[PDB]
Amino acid sequence: KPVLLKSTETGQYLRINPDGTVDGTRDRSDQHIQFQVSPEGGGEVLLKSTETGQYLRINPDGTVDGTRDRSDQHIQFQVSPEGGGEVLLKSTETGQYLRINPDGTVDGTRDRSDQHIQFQVSP
Structure with a gap:
């Protein structure tokens, strides 16, 4: 089932836009905030935009975007x-946690003590 991924601090929902950018929004009418969680191997997950088919990716440089490249090793x-x-969402390849900043940008951080990396997952 589709879930929403909400940063507990800002009440912003993660969104993957059709153009591949990823940001945060409070518009729960937005169809682009729905995700499918699916397994990757035995202990990892992929986070896929239900509407666009794009997977969430944290790049080595800390930027976060969407890709449909199933071979990508930064989507796990x-x-x-x-x-x-609440849960943290940690990219296995780079050890970065997903972060939604108050300005609505989405990026990665290794700092597990950051207060903008906690998410509430709801159906």
Whole structure:
């Protein structure tokens, strides 16, 4: 089933836009905030835009975008329970956590103590 990925701090939902950019929004009418979680091998997941088919990618330089390249090694995530229903979403290849900043940009950070990397996943 499609889930939403909401940063607990800003109430912003992760969005992959058709043009490949990734950002945050509070417009729950946006069809582009729905994701399909699917398995990659035994312990990782992919986070796919239901509407566009793009996978969330954290690049080595910390930028976050969408790709349909299934061979990409920067689309695999580990989900860690953070207590209180919240989870962190960590890219396995680079050790970066997904972050939604207050200005609505989305990027990666290795800093596990950052307050903008906690997500609430809802159906």
